[PDB]
Amino acid sequence: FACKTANGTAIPIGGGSANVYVNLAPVVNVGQNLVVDLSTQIFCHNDYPETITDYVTLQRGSAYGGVLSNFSGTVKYSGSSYPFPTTSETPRVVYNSATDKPWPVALYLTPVSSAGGVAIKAGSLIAVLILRQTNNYNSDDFQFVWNIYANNDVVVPT
Ligand SMILES: COC(=O)c1cccc(-c2ccc(O[C@H]3O[C@H](CO)[C@@H](O)[C@H](O)[C@@H]3O)c(Cl)c2)c1
């Protein structure tokens, strides 16, 4: 089991870390949602699918920088919504193919009432998401750590 970003940066068998760089809606008013769809940015596959099935959770997700200070939100994982920053590990998604396929994670963030101006600075760290992978074959328990960075400013108008 291994993963990569949309630009080909890989995390190999056994886990590791990588940076993910995301475009963000540039203007989000209070009351609107900023969507950070990682399913178009992070892909994974199973390396021995005829014998092994891989099980993948979002173990935990943390907010940083302007997301931590200026937004509240949820994380949607494979169709179900949870608090973000996270308060539990999600259920499993099954990876049963050698085809790289999306990791089905998206953040839904909305500004706090006091937010205004540049609420997320371009280039800044906005989140760290831990993908946790186990299987039905051995005791493997690996983390793929995704450090999520903004490619552009997000403004909450005043
Ligand atoms: C087509 O494959 C073959 O012919 C073949 C032949 C011999 C051995 C293997 C093989 C490959 C990968 C394996 O472990 C990695 O991949 C697992 C499946 O994603 C993960 O659960 C596990 O954690 C680890 O990332 C293991 Cl244990 C065995 C494959």
Side-chain angles (χ1 to χ4, degrees):
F1 180 90
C3 301
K4 64 174 195 174
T5 74
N7 67 27
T9 304
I11 304 182
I13 284 164
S17 304
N19 296 341
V20 187
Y21 299 95
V22 296
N23 300 317
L24 301 167
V27 178
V28 183
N29 290 284
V30 181
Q32 296 186 302
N33 282 331
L34 172 65
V35 183
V36 188
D37 185 5
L38 289 321
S39 74
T40 59
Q41 305 298 313
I42 300 169
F43 306 83
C44 302
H45 71 275
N46 174 330
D47 284 308
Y48 197 6
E50 294 184 0
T51 293
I52 301 181
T53 303
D54 291 319
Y55 306 108
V56 171
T57 65
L58 173 68
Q59 180 175 7
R60 54 177 172 269
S62 295
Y64 290 91
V67 169
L68 179 64
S69 301
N70 298 312
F71 293 80
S72 69
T74 54
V75 55
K76 196 173 288 184
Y77 189 61
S78 199
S80 297
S81 293
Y82 307 92
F84 179 77
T86 60
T87 60
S88 64
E89 176 166 12
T90 65
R92 299 162 172 183
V93 171
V94 172
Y95 283 79
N96 57 11
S97 176
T99 298
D100 269 335
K101 292 179 176 188
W103 191 40
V105 179
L107 309 179
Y108 291 79
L109 307 174
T110 195
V112 300
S113 59
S114 66
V118 177
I120 297 172
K121 292 178 183 181
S124 65
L125 182 70
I126 60 169
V128 173
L129 308 175
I130 303 186
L131 180 165
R132 180 182 191 180
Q133 174 249 326
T134 64
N135 62 39
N136 70 348
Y137 187 79
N138 63 22
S139 295
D140 292 349
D141 181 0
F142 298 132
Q143 294 173 316
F144 292 71
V145 180
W146 306 102
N147 304 307
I148 315 303
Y149 291 85
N151 281 340
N152 58 269
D153 284 347
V154 179
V155 170
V156 179
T158 51

